[PDB]
Design a binder for these strands. Structure first.
Lengths: 56, 56, 54, 56
RNA sequence: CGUACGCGGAAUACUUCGA
RNA sequence: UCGAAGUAUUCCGCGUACG
RNA sequence: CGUACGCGGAAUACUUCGA
RNA sequence: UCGAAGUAUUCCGCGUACG
């Protein structure tokens, strides 16, 4: 029986997003300071050089 | 197993809302042109003049 | 204070309504004998496959 | 720019919630183990014992 | 005591896209 | 080397609410 | 043929807020 | 007389997508 404006629903999520966003930004930094990468994270990196060095 | 960006869920509800807004705008106008009002839309109006008159 | 439980429930109804909005709307096009360009293909493309089994 | 079935948006929130729900459940059991309560929880508790010992 | 949502504050791991 | 998102395993504090 | 979604485009009615 | 939001009956067109 509560009037829940769409605008008010939108809002709650925007928050849930920027929150969840700020968590990666921080988690990302934490992983750099440890020097950690996920299997995939490595594979992108390695390949990236391969390509661009192979360019000149 | 498709990924659903919150930024999208938002973008969607944003749409739902304007569509829902413009409806009213048209609808509200359509009413005025017939001169129709609701039982609720009456009390408020009547009560407003009465209040507004009871001021001057 | 907006519990998630509500966002859910609010959206539930909305879907179930847009459901009937179609279910009715679909049935309505049938009594006219109207189809979409897309519905023609999906229809005439379908029989060809069935008239070929027996 | 892909279509998003409202069933799936919902399907996401359901999940999301069932998480929130499950953290609180264990987080609650974590407190109970340390015997830690909240100011709110102190009243709620005490203010309940007096309405309990009296009214029966 | 038991149940229920809200919010603010932070870990750790994995995958997917894109230059 | 950058950028974007998604998924799981976690911890802390306060705050209404309901019998 | 049956079934599940998406999108954009409309009418009509009623209620709660707020000056 | 203005602004905002929420619920209801109902209608139309194209698009996929499934067996």
């Amino acid at each position: 029986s509560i009037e829940i404006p769409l605008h008010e629903i939108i809002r709650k999520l925007e928050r849930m997003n920027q929150k969840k966003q700020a968590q990666r930004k921080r988690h990302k930094l934490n992983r750099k300071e440890r020097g950690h990468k996920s299997p995939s994270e490595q594979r992108r990196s390695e390949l990236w050089h391969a390509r661009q060095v192979e360019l000149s």
